[PDB]
Amino acid sequence: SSHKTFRIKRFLAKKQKQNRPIPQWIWMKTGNKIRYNSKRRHWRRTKLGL
Amino acid sequence: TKGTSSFGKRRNKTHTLCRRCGSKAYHLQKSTCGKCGYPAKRKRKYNWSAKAKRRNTTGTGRMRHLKIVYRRFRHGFREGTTPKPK
Amino acid sequence: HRSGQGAFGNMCRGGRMFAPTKTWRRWHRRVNTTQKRYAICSALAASALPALVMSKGHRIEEVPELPLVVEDKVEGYKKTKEAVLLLKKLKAWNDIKKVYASQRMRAGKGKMRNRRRIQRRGPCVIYNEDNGIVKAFRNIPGITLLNVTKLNILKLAPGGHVGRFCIWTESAFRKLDDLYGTWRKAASLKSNYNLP
Amino acid sequence: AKIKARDLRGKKKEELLKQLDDLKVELSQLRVAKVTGGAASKLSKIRVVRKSIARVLTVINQTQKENLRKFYKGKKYKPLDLRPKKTRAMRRRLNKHEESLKTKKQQRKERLYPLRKYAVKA
Amino acid sequence: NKHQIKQAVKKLYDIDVAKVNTLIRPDGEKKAYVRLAPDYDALDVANKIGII
RNA sequence: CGACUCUUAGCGGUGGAUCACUCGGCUCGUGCGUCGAUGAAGAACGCAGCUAGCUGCGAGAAUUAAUGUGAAUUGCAGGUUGAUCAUCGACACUUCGAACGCACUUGCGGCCCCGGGUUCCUCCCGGGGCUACGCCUGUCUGAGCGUCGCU
RNA sequence: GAAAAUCCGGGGGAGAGGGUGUAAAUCUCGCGCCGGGCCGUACCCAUAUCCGCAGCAGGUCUCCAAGGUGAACAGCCUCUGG
RNA sequence: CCGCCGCAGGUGCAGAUCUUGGUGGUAGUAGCAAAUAUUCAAACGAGAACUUUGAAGGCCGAAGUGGAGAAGGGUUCCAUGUGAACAGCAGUUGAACAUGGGUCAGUCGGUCCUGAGAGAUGGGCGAGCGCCGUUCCGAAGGGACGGGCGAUGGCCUCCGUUG
RNA sequence: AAAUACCGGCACGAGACCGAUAGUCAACAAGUACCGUAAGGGAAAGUUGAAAAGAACUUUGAAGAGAGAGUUCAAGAGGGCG
RNA sequence: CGCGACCUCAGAUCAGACGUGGCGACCCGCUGAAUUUAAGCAUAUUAGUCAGCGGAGGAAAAGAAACUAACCAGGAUUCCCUCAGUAACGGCGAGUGAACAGGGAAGAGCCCAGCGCCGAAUCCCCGCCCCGCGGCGGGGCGCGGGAAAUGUGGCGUACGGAAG
C-alpha cells in the first residue's frame, strides 16, 4: 500500500531496476545468445510475490 | 460461496520475507520461518526432502569465504610472506 | 508445462528407463587357467602356417622364409629409423604400409566417445629382454610389443581369429621351449603344465 | 595521467591524503558530467579515477598495517587482525613445542631402547 | 541524515544551508532538496558545481 | 462441361521428425580430505562510460596490490617505467545471518574517547573504540544465626 | 462496558535563602535564544490499477452527501461532478 | 559411412482413456445479447461506428458511474513518441510499448504505551532438537540524597567534575 | 596408528554408456521463468555461414510486406536461419 | 561488637581464552514406524530399516583379553576369503542367521589410580630484560601472586613391581 516499510520499498526498488529490456549493443557481441529479456515481469501478468 | 466469492476477502497476509534465507515464509503471528525457522539457532532442514536440501546448501550461494579456503588450501594456508619482488 | 504431464514409467517423457542399468552387472568373465594356455597353444601354432596368416590378412608375401625369428641385436635398438629399416630388410614393411592405408575414421558414436580413428593390426614383435626395442617400435602404427613370459591372447589373436604375423627374436624364440615344454618335457617356467 | 603504486609506497604520510582528496574532487567533477550528458572523453576517464583511488587507499591501508606488525611483533598479545588467520580448527591445534613434549618416562623408554638399524642373512 | 548532508554541501561547496528535505525515490536512492540561505545565490553556485 | 470431391506425382506452405555434430550428462577409478565469534553456510542489497539477466565483485565494489605473462581489451565510444590474462601470499571485504548493546520498527539506549558548537564547559551534531549468553583459569569487591578463630 | 505510557494538583515540611542590601535563594509571569534526526508520503481503491488464471455481472473496510414529490437515506426526476 | 567373421545390448510398435510434441474434421461454425442511447459537424491523420473538440439528446441522481482514504497493488502516476504484439471489431487510442520525469514534514502517520496475547532469564521437565512457565522454588536495585582525604577545568577560589 | 569406509567437498583421468522426447531437474540468463498463503512444486528451450560477407543502391505501399539488385560454393543457408 | 583464616556461594563491559552454527557421502550415540511378506492376520517379517534427534573426524569407531578354546593349544583391534545359508531362532510357518578355527591385508604397543618412597621434589599466571617465534616458545629475574597434603611430579601397573 501507500503505508510501506523501508525494507519492502528497497525490495520494490530492485524489482523496477530489473524490469528494463536488454541494451541494443549486447547482441552485437561475439558470444551472442541473448535475443530479449525473458525475465521481464508486468503488474497484471505476475504479482511479484508478497 | 466457498470458491470464487471467498477469494475476494484475501487482503491480509500471514507470511512476510524471512531475514536469514530471504524466503517469503516468515509467519507473522507465529514469528517463525516455515523454510528455515528463524528464532531457532539451527537451520530447519529434513531428509524427507533431498530436493529442498540442494536448493539451499553450500553449492547454492557465492561461498565468498568457502571458495578462497579451497584456493588457499592448495598452498597449505600460507600467511604473511610475499613473493620475492623485482 | 510439467504440471499434470506424466512423470514415472518407461513410456513417459522424462521419467526412468525400464530396468535401469546397474553397476553390479556381471561385467567380468573369469576363464580356466588351463584354457588360457590352450588358447595361446592354438594362437602361436596357427602363426607359423602362412595360409592362416594370409587368411588373417597380414601382407606376408615377401617374408623370405620362416615363422620369422631375428637376431638378438633388435632388442638393442633405441630409435625407430633403426626399427623401420629392419622391417624393410625382413620385408614385413608392406604389412605397415597396409596399416597406414587402413588409417580411416570410425563409423558413428565412437568418434564423440574418444575412439575417433580405426587402423589395422600389423606385425607383433615378441621379445626376451628390453634394451629399447619397445621405445624403437612403439611409434610405428600396427606393431604391438609382447614379452615372451607374458603373452596376451588379445594381442596374439586379435578379433578372436588366429594367425597374427608374429616376428620373434632369437633368445625369445628358444624360451617358448621352456614356458610350454614339448610333449615329453614338462614346462620349466610353469608349475604343472604340458602341451595339450 | 598514469598513477602507479611503486612511487606512492616511498612517499610521506600526509601527502597521500592530499593526493586522495585531489582525486575525490576529480571523480566528483566527472559524476556531474555523466548526468549533464556532455564530453564522452570525461566518462572513459571516470574508471581511471575510481581504480586510482583504490590504489591510494590501498597504499594507505598497506603501510598502516606493516607499521602495526612492526611495533606489535615483539609483544605476547597482538590484535586479532595481526594474528595468523589459518583455519579455525588449525588454530585450536597444539603448539609446535607442545607436540615436542614427551613424558619423562617416554624419554627413558626411547633412551634405553632406541629403534635399531638392523638386517638379516638370507 | 539531514545533518550529515548539511555539512556535506557546506564542506564541498563553501556554502550554507537553510534546511534539507530528503525523499527516497522509487529507484531506491535518496534525493536531498538543499535549500541554500539567501546570503548565497543558488543559480550562481550551479555554475561552480557545473550543471546547466 | 466446370464447381465440389477423391487418388497420385511435382512445386510451395505448415510442423520439427530423421540424420550429422556436442564447451553437457551419467558411470567407474584415482589423489586430496580444507568451513565458523579473526564473523561460516546462507540471504539481502549494491557496484560497469553505455549493462536488464548470467557470472565477477563489496563504498577500494566486473575489482586494488603483488608475483608471473609480455601487447591488447573489443559490441561501441574514449585514453614498455608493462597492456592483457593467469596466479594470488599483501590489503580490503556494506546489511541481515550461530549474529553479539536492547528490539526487528532498522526503531531506541548507555559509557569512554575525539572533532565541529569550541578554545573544556555543558546541551547539540558527526565520527570512533566498547557493550550478547554459557563457560574456563586467575583477579577484584562482597555475602552467610557455614565452620571456627582472637579480644 | 480496557489497561498502560504520560501528565498535573494536593498533603507533608527534611532543607535552602539573604541580613537590610548593588539584597539573596527562588518563579508554572512576559519577552529572547537554539534545536527537532529516522522511516512512509506518487497513483487505483473498484462493472479496467486489489483477490477470483482475464478490463471476470462475483467478492472486498470506511468518510462527505444538493433541489422537488414524500412518513422517508423508499422510488422516480433534476443541479454540481462524472 | 558400410559389407563380412565374432562380441554386446536400454535392439524392431498401431493399440496401453499409453507419454511428449504437432495437426485435422467439426468451422469461418458456437459465439463477440446482463445494468435505456446515441446523433451531427470540424480537427489531427495514409486510414474513423469507436480518437479529440464544439453542438445536441441521454444515463448515474448525494446509501451515485461523484470527491477521498484503509487493505492489497508496485510505477500501474505524469509527459513525449511509434502504433509490431496485447487490450476477444477497430484504433491516430490505453492501465500495451519505448524513452524519460515524478512521492520534500518538530506539527500527518510510523516510532512510544499497553490490550487480548506473544515470549526470554531463574527454575522444572527433557534421550535430545528443545520444551513448560512468566512471577512461580531467584542474592532479580548499578539509582539518588548525604559525609572527609585525593584529584582534574577554572586566580584547585570553590563548585561543576571524579573515586 | 596401519590395513578399512566414502552417492558430500577440492582437483583430476577414463568409458563396448547417453546423444537434446536421450543423458542429471538443468548441454542454453536452471533450481531459472512460473504456480501455491506456506511447506513445497518446478519447466520448455542446442545448430545461419568458412568468414556477417547479416541483403548497399533503385522502385510499390502508411508501414508490414514485396519486385530488382548485391554477398556466398549455396539464401534451393535471410537474424529461433544445417 | 570488631578484625583474621577458611568453607560454601554471588556479582562484574574484571585479565586472558574457549563453546554455539553449517556441511553431513562415509562415521558414533539414541529414537524408531508402516507399506510389504506370511496368498487372510495379530507373533514374526519388513527392520533396529526410512523418518526424527545429538556428535565428530580426515577417516570415525573398535583395540592390546574379566578372549578363544578343550588342542600337541592358540593370543589386541580392523578388514578380506572361508566357515555358511552352517550351529541356532521361528504361528519350528513365512522367513531370519552368527561365531571359533583356518588362509591373508596390516601389524605396535601402552599410561594412570590404588600400594609404596623421595624436605610438593610439581604446576599455571603476571611484572623485568634477552636472542626471538604469521603453531608465544627457550633462558635469566624478583622473601611477586596462585594451584596443591580433600595429593602435584618422579619411580611403578599384572607381562609383575619397589628397595637393600
Instruction: Say whether the CB atom of A39 is under 7 angstroms from strand H.
Output: no
- Residue C55 phi/psi, 5-degree rounding, is -65, -25
Cβ–Cβ < 8 Å for E26, A13: yes
Q: What is the 3-state secondary structure (H, E, C) of chain B?
A: CCCHHHHHHCCCCCEECCCCCCCCCEECCCCEECCCCCCCCCCCCCCCCHHHHHCCCCCCCCCCCHHHHHHHHCCCCCCCCCCCCC
- Written as nine digits, the cell of C14 is 522424462
Which residue of E lies nearest to A12 if distances are taken between CA atoms? Answer: E26
Calculate the alpha carbon distances from C124 to C58, C137, C155, D49 in Å: 11, 10, 8, 71
Q: What is the 3-state secondary structure (H, E, C) of chain D?
A: CCCCCCCCCCCCHHHHHHHHHHHHHHHHCHHHHHHHCCCCHHHHHHHHHHHHHHHHHHHHHHHCCCCHHHHCCCCCCCCCCCCCCCCHHHHCCCCCCCCCCCCCCHHHHHHHCCCCCCCCCC
Q: With an 8 Å Cβ cutoff, are B80 and D84 in contact?
A: yes
- Written as nine digits, the cell of D44 is 572513459
- Written as nine digits, the cell of D90 is 588449525
Q: How far is A50 from chain B (nearest CA, A)?
A: 7
**B21 is an annotated ligand-binding site residue:** yes
Helical (H) or strand (E) element with C169: strand C166-169
Distance CA E27, CA A17 (A): 7
- Give me the residues paired with residue C143 across strands: none
Transcribe E1-52 into DSSP letters. Answer: -HHHHHHHHHHHHS--EEEEEEEE-TTS-EEEEEEE-TTS-HHHHHHHHT--
Chains E and B touch (3+ CB pairs under 8 A): no
**B74 is an annotated ligand-binding site residue:** no
Amino acid at E18: A
Q: How far is D26 from chain B (nearest CA, A)?
A: 32
**Interface contact A49, partner B, CB < 8 A:** yes
- Residue C44 phi/psi, 5-degree rounding, is -70, -40
Nucleotides of G under 7 A from a protein CB: 36-45, 49-55, 58-60
CA of E19 to C1' of G27 (A): 36
3-class secondary-structure state, position C117: strand
Q: Please give the method by which this entry was determined.
A: cryo-EM
- Give me the residues paired with residue C147 across strands: C127
The answer for E 8-27 residues in CB contact with D (under 8 A) is 12
**Interface contact B55, partner A, CB < 8 A:** no
Specify the nucleotide whose C1' lies closest to residue D47 (CA). Answer: F49
Calculate the alpha carbon distances from B12 to B4, B5, B8, B15 in Å: 17, 16, 11, 10
Helical (H) or strand (E) element with A10: helix A6-17
Q: How far is B60 from chain A (nearest CA, A)?
A: 20
Strand duo E30-36 + E17-24: pairing: antiparallel
Helical (H) or strand (E) element with C37: helix C33-40
Distance CA B76, CA C7 (A): 48
In chain D the first and final C-alpha atoms are separated, in Å, by 81
Sign of CA pseudo-dihedral C108, C110, C114, C116: negative
Specify the nucleotide whose C1' lies closest to residue B47 (CA). Answer: J51
Strand duo E30-36 + C117-118: pairing: unpaired
Burial of D14 (0-12, 13-18, 19+ CB in 10 A): exposed
Closest CA to C177 of C191, C195, C192: C195
Closest CA to C57 of C121, C111, C148: C121
List b or e across B1-20, with b for residues whose CB sees 16 or more CB atoms inside 10 angstroms.
eeeeeeeeeeeeeebbbbee
Instruction: Say whether the CB atom of E1 is under 7 angstroms from strand F.
Output: yes
Amino acid at D111: R
Which residue of D lies nearest to E11 if distances are taken between CA atoms? Answer: D25
Helical (H) or strand (E) element with C167: strand C166-169
Distance CA D22, CA D44 (A): 19
Q: Alpha-carbon dihedral of residues D87, D89, D91, D95, nearest 10 degrees?
A: -130
3-class secondary-structure state, position A44: coil
In chain A the first and final C-alpha atoms are separated, in Å, by 12
